[PDB]
Design a protein around this nucleic acid. Sequence first.
DNA 1: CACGGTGGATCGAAAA
DNA 2: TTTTCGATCCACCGTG
DNA 3: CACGGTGGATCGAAAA
DNA 4: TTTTCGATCCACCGTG
Lengths: 460, 460
Amino acid sequence: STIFSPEKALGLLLSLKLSKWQYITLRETTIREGSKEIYPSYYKVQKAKLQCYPPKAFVAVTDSSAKIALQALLDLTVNRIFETIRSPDAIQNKQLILISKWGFDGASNQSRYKQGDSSIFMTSLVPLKLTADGDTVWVNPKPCSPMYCRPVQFSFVKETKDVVINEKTAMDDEIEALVPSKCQGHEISHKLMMTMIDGKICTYLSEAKSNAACYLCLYEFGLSTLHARINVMECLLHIAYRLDFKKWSARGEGHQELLHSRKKLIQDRFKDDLNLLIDIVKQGSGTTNDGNTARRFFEFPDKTAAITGLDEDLIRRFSVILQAITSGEIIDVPKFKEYARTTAEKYVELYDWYYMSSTVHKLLIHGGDIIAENAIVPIGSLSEEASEARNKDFRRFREHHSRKKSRQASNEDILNMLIISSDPLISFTRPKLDAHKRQTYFKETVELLQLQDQEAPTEF
Amino acid sequence: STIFSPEKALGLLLSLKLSKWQYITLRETTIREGSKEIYPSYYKVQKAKLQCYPPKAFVAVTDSSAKIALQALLDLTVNRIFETIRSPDAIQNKQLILISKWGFDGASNQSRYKQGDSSIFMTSLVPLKLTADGDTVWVNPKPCSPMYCRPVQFSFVKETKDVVINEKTAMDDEIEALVPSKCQGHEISHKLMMTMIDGKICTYLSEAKSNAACYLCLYEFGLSTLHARINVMECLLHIAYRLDFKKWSARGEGHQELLHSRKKLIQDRFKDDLNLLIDIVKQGSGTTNDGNTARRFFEFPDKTAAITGLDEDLIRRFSVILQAITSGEIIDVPKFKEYARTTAEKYVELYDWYYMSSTVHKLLIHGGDIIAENAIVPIGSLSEEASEARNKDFRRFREHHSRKKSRQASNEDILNMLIISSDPLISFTRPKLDAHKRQTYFKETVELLQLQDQEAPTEF
DNA sequence: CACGGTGGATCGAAAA
DNA sequence: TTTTCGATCCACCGTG
DNA sequence: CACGGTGGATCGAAAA
DNA sequence: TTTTCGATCCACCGTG
């Protein structure tokens, strides 16, 4: 007999982001004005939380890192998504399977020059849909939202590709290491897709291309593995590297100095223009600073194409063809094919000195027919907004919410609040934003795309 | 017909420190669970706030600074303290006067090395009691609390003594510039005391002593003007400066180098010990870093007296006699007098080389009889906890609450939330602390003081 | 180094 | 017996 | 520069 | 007529 359910009061704690102290104070002030039934006491919130945890048999918590058993975590999640909204026993007869996207990335812990918090990265899983015979019973209303990035693991390690392959291999041991979920008198098998990637990890792990050659030219998407964004921007800035002589080679001692000084002044002017972070940053002598900035190369098409002096029209065409696929809309096979033909005419004509990179040519002659029979899927990688807000809350949880003790339970409580944000039982009432904020992109997309869609994604 | 009064809902916004967004979200979630009458909508909170403001005829708001008319502010405050708890028309007949303490100080805006927010300082007023014939009708339950530091002015200027005297003079023009308050069919005159001082401003403004001489030795409290703390610690560290030769003079080129290096190593070891901020800090070649640290010289009596190697017993005696006055307890005239005699015996004996400073000797021969007929009052300067939490909220209000616009209304909103924290109508439910936290100080106080007190101040 | 802030462990009592 | 619930207490961490 | 966050101005409608 | 109330919109400011 309480107004707020404890199961709703936990989501109330979520939306407000309160302390324990804040919550007890608010309840008690509601009390002292004669009204009792509104706020449940904190103890029932505690019980709701312990319910939302998986049992501590599977928690691996350290000062440095933490993880969970994928099996038990999936079972917990399907138990919840049972209980919350599935109209119970709408069907029992046909055998059920649960579909999920998964993956991970990280970021550096930017801080003052007087700080051990260096970087973080988080193994992650998101349930997308629950399938039965009559239909997929369950769907996520806002899949790309961070509301369902159930954490699987995280660690306090810099994003060095070695430990990246180590966690890669580990999770690849665990993919088959599941037994189907058994709960609620029901068996439900599982199925995963590894797509929740930042945009550099397939260049880390599938580097076997290395711009070597093009197989058809003489399957591998590139659009579904980092979206091939970084390669195109990297090769066009390599052109911007070679924008003085407009020649393939500069090797022998003829251009190195003025090349270096020209890129220095490009890096300067870009620091003036967009707060583009330093590109001579170490990174092992290779510049890849930001993939979101890589995208921001293409929302200023005319602007940065003037800054680089390349034909704004051509890179505008390519920005169009790039933003035309990941949106996942129906693309006309022959029209986009022959537009790739015309843009290739101009690409190969107006630039002869340098060579085409891997994924560009893979698109040029080869990409269209690949789009014909492709398994193109809007990659389940959480939105850039999602990942950014995730880092935001992570910083804050560690800073304004975490326990201050021997600090192992610190990261425990972090995982706790994360999985609470994950448990689909709580309908997490996110901070308000404009309803759609989905800017229908350039007219060159508007006519090169088709508006007959069983989707309308804002970002994914 | 709402559970929370808007006048209480504003204090509810205070205790929780919420956004507008947070408040509307919490109310609406209370709505969607069938219960309406609990939370008043934000509009009535708006009205409560505009009521709590003084009319904008008197607001002086800038990008840089802001102030109010003392007259109108006092009238607003007495109007509130009328309405809130005065049992109305308990008396009308006898003419009423209102007593208030006032003053100001500031602090630097400590920030990263990548920041215009440099320092702040705030003219301030606090109403203590309202007087009538039968009794002082109104008292403050927790006077030294920051709950009633009604802001009068503040500015974005470094604490340079020039503008300090300028604001000093300004407020001294305004003291007499009041007409008695007229509201509620009642006249009530006013009366102020300038005591809300940091601890350096009377050394700024009443520097006419300059350790020159002692008048009685051949009125001016020193205990009621900065409590004479900084002078005693400064002269004893000057002794610590001269703790190698233990002689008055070192002037000619004989000691300057090793003096400098010795104070360097003292500053080093103190940086290791307490996080004592740098003392060679510019300040115009004069070291006065922190008055709270000046106090913290005396809560480690044996510790820092060992670090300086001075007799821990003597400075322990002086710490006792200092903490024995501002607590305001009844002090036995002859016993404390003759204890000042004995501590003077040992002070003047064990140290002959240097000379006594002003306020020390003023205490020694002279201070006791001055305590006899003194106007000793526990100085109305807000607690160090109060001022610290004030800087804390100021930083946060500017950072997590302020409007982000042309930023004049920024400091407007700052003043707004401050005066809301001030309006005595709202019984501000502060963050919880231990009930008393009043450590009954050293036994040398316990017997040199008397326990027959119509006061028991935790800090003031 | 002392002093505010921290979700969850424990007390312990009362309840229940 | 369980179950609530307020009190505390942690051990660390900023700015002092 | 683009993108989340901000108390108070205005709309505007409905109410009232 | 007034009075509420949700929507928006500000123009700036961090980390990107």
